[PDB]
Design a protein around this ligand. Structure first.
Ligand SMILES: [Ca+2]
Ligand SMILES: [Ca+2]
Ligand SMILES: [Ca+2]
Ligand SMILES: [Ca+2]
Ligand SMILES: [Ca+2]
Ligand SMILES: [Ca+2]
Lengths: 611, 623
């Protein structure tokens, strides 16, 4: 038998008609339609005498098949002449690494082939007339939608994971290239950004430290810190682009033209010939998708954003009712509105995410990258508003810096400690307990090594995505760039949390969730726009907070109109300089730009020779 | 052969130099030098012909022209309706091609290829220009550049096709502009201007119609001003975004959009140590980017800032001169005083012209000294330098009257002079007067040829003598600047001067015919440049639409109608205005981001070609 890489779990009582049909499509050659992979059940006929196979099936492929699949996805690898080119089976000897493809790459290729399994003449899933099919429809999608296939997931490499673990937690630089090799470009990019952002916050943590310790509340002192803050915000987000470009080029994912990739299983449409790639795949009119975006999805997001402000106002009206009652058991009643609002926020965030996931799926995006960018953008604007609208209200409407400091202190200390317990420490404790339980059950049987590994990973938690992880750092960047003049220790507590966040998130990836399917990402996606918008908002925030300070208002006792005009002029000058600085700093280093240019030139010379 | 390009040499150039120049223009590319055809204007001279002896005609073979078309990378439509770069080996696959036919490449394309080959004529072992030891040479140095710098070669220019120009003329002046016909004769750059001119005139029409009842019925209300300014800010973004889409359609059809101009050979003005290019692998001059960057930010940038400060200093003298003139009219009491009021405006306008001609010489010098590799880079940097100076001299006085003096009566009168009197005088100076003078020279040349009485046909002789002494078209800058300043008065001060767009459309209705006469019967044929966009002008026009948000919000916030609502709380009023301004600037950027710069069908056509290039690279590395 083969090396098992991907597991497919089928429902409770799936018909044999369906099982054999699914087996045929996963085994049959691509010429006859269907992936040319290998299919086998978790347990053999001999071991099925005791341990019955609970409709769990293992998927693998040939060494030649894997290399042909690597060409299909367009994996870029380094050649002997140190140039990065897309892999081809005919040109396999020219590649430097040629153990060539990692397990993560192998499992991604298998996932890609299973996702591109499309219905030919089948009018339904055999045995299930309710689960109707049409030419071009993704089989894996229809199987998951109907509920015939419960889940498809890649298997962990216990020995490889343990080797990475020892080089990961502990003191030195994070092994981003090792994380890439096991989890993929997307997960390694997150741990690469986390390590970078922690180092990026260090200057702001060191500069902000004497502002708290010696209580520096002067005009000159605040202007110096805010000026440094605005320069820091631009320079770190610009230097990240350059650093990411170096890393993704080395990986080869930067040279990948992801726009020509095959559509996601969730993409529906009339089967036809693609105008660009020439592939027989589903076709959906862009205007239908655009109308759903701007006429249904956009007004819904705006309604939820308005409702968020409406709910926030109820909390600030509830804090008035609670303060009046305390002024007239009362000390307990003061905590009550903060407890209620925080609970309502959690109810709102879980409900909006279901509505956002539905609408982005309904929008019908062709590529997974597009679906992700649109889904992140929807959930992010809602999560940002619910988190910062109350903070902005205290700072600029209430103008209560004592309450704002206490609000930020809860968010940066108590909330981050509780977050780490809920995020990885508690789920790890619970997963470790399940791990012993399963291990003991297998010992009592009297070779179920792979059986135990599949049963364990099957019931393990599914990693939802890098969104929740990046959002933590986005909100961190929010408190630091916006209110560092109010709370100078903002960056100090951000670095302290991030010092344990690397260890906690690693533990969450290794011993909590089952292996997530690798995605060849070339950047942090729509997060770059999000972080850059936050650095633009920080100009407005820092200029307002300085203009609001009683030190500046002492200079302008009557002429308050003049003061605002000066502040607005300074704000406009800073916003212009911020854009010039971002334009002046190239998003890619010189050597990467030249390497990308020579490859661009080669493609044009190749097209002239081929025609 | 058929003469296409003319090379004029200085009055007494040595035969050593003439034969050497002839050799480099005729010798095969393998031995170094363009594989073109060289011949003198006349083989038979007379007394009146002996003067015009150093005139030489340049042409090329049909095969040579096609090989030269491949070298520049001209993109033409294939039989499968796809746009691909020309190759002599793949010549049969291109639509409209026939070996016996010479109608494939236009005269404008042909003359561009010849110019390109003459510009890429580089010195091999020559340590100087033969016969002129002062005009030193080194390996890699452009011969055409050194010949023009030393003064051995006076000028190099393409010849007009009289019959073709007359056919275009009848379809041009008088319906929609024949942009594809202008492209065929003058090139992508000149046709792009007339394409933008025609578009901008149509784009201004809504603003001219909306602004018309604001003047006629004198609509000076809060609601009325907000509606117009809101429409103005939406209009500014949408027209500049729709232009990008329209330009993309046109440049794709032309093929210039599919051209990768970044890999093109350097301009003749580019100097450096001869070496191998890291990207193209071509043996061309090499210059370190850091040296160019230091010259830009440490010498050129502070100079531009000094001239910009001096412009504000000179402007202040004018606003101090208008005070001296207002006092001399008012303290005295006669008629002679009414004449003295016009005097400072006349002096300042003259000083501005002296400043603009002097700064342009300094800007042309510094951009050449910066040492840019591509002609596109030299143009974008030169446009940007001259534009910030021309914009400041034109608008600093307008901004001073509007926000320092806060005199809307004076601002209206200032814009009225700029949009009516100044635009009428501009058209006379731009084409009407130079055409009158060129027509007079035309009669003088025709009479000179009639007096010859030679045993040869002096049709080509007359054509060369005429076009040689004709004015040289400096570039599309002055032409685009007119429309940029127009867009400036319209997008910024439409709330103050509602007829701004009305007079802009009226001038542009004659500008099309005035600039057509200018390009046909005033200047000699300009060398075609395959442009794929309006260049740095897109950034300039977009910055103007960003400034218009600040301007319209300030002018509305300043109006006594809004200040009537806020009698004491002036701080609150500014906070509302600034909040509205920030919201509009955000929405303006979102709207520009939402509108795709290229249409769906062009994006797909560009995508399939991008995919084909990757599939080609995979097949070539396999080969
Ligand atoms: Ca955490
Ligand atoms: Ca996390
Ligand atoms: Ca940048
Ligand atoms: Ca004019
Ligand atoms: Ca003009
Ligand atoms: Ca756009």
């Amino acid at each position: 038998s083969f090396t098992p890489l991907v597991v497919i779990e089928l429902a409770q009582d799936v018909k044999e008609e369906t099982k054999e049909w699914l087996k045929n499509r996963i085994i049959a050659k691509k010429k006859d339609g269907g992936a040319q992979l290998l299919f086998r059940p978790l347990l053999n006929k001999y071991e099925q005498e005791t341990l019955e196979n609970q409709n769990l099936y293992l998927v693998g492929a040939s060494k030649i098949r894997m290399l042909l699949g690597a060409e299909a996805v367009g994996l870029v690898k380094e050649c002997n002449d140190n140039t990065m080119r897309a892999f081809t089976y005919r040109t396999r000897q020219n590649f430097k690494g040629f153990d060539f493809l990692t397990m993560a790459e192998c499992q991604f290729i298998i996932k890609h082939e299973l996702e591109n399994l499309r219905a030919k003449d089948e009018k339904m899933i055999p045995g299930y007339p309710q689960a109707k099919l049409y030419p071009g429809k993704s089989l894996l999608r229809r199987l998951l939608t109907s509920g015939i296939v419960i889940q498809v997931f890649p298997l962990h490499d216990s020995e490889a994971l343990k080797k990475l673990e020892d080089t990961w937690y502990t003191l030195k630089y994070q092994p981003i290239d090792s994380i890439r090799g096991y989890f993929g470009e997307t997960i390694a990019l997150y741990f690469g950004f986390l390590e970078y952002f922690t180092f990026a916050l260090i200057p702001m943590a060191v500069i902000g430290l004497p502002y708290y310790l010696f209580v520096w509340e002067d005009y000159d002192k605040y202007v110096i810190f805010a000026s440094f803050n605005l320069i820091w915000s631009t320079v770190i987000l610009e230097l990240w682009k350059r650093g990411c470009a170096n890393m993704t080029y080395r990986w080869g994912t930067l040279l990948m033209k992801r726009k020509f990739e095959e559509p996601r299983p969730g993409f529906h449409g009339v089967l036809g010939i693609n105008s660009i790639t020439g592939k027989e795949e589903p076709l959906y009119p862009s205007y239908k998708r655009q109308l759903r975006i701007y006429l249904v999805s956009l007004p819904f997001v705006c309604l939820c954003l308005y409702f968020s402000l409406y709910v926030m106002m109820i909390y600030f009206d509830m804090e008035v009712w609670a303060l009046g009652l305390h002024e007239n058991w009362t000390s307990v009643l003061l905590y009550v509105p903060s407890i209620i609002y925080a609970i309502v926020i959690e109810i709102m965030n879980r409900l909006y995410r279901y509505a956002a996931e539905f609408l982005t799926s309904w929008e019908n995006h062709r590529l997974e990258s597009a679906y992700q960018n649109h889904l992140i953008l929807k959930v992010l604007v809602f999560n940002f508003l619910n988190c910062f609208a109350s903070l902005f209200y205290i700072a600029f409407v209430l103008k209560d810096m004592k309450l704002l400091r206490q609000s930020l202190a809860t968010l940066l200390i108590t909330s981050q400690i509780l977050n780490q317990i809920m995020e990885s420490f508690l789920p790890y404790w619970l997963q470790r307990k399940h791990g012993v339980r399963v291990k003991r059950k297998v010992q009592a049987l009297k070779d179920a090594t792979l059986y135990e590994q599949v049963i364990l990973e099957k019931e393990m938690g599914t990693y939802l995505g890098t969104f929740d992880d990046y959002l933590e750092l986005f909100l961190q960047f929010g408190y630091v760039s916006l209110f560092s003049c109010v709370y100078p220790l903002a960056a100090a507590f951000a670095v302290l949390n991030n010092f344990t966040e690397v260890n906690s998130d690693a533990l969450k990836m290794c011993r909590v969730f089952k292996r997530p399917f690798s995605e060849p990402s070339a950047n942090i996606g729509v997060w770059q726009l999000a972080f850059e918008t936050m650095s633009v908002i920080s100009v407005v925030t820092n200029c307002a907070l300085i203009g609001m300070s009683p030190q500046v208002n002492a200079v302008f006792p009557e002429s308050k109109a003049d003061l605002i005009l000066i502040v607005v002029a300074v704000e406009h000058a800073l916003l212009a300089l911020k854009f010039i600085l971002a334009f002046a700093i190239p998003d890619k280093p010189r050597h990467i730009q030249m390497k990308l240019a020579r490859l661009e030139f080669e493609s044009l010379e190749a097209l002239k020779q081929q025609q």
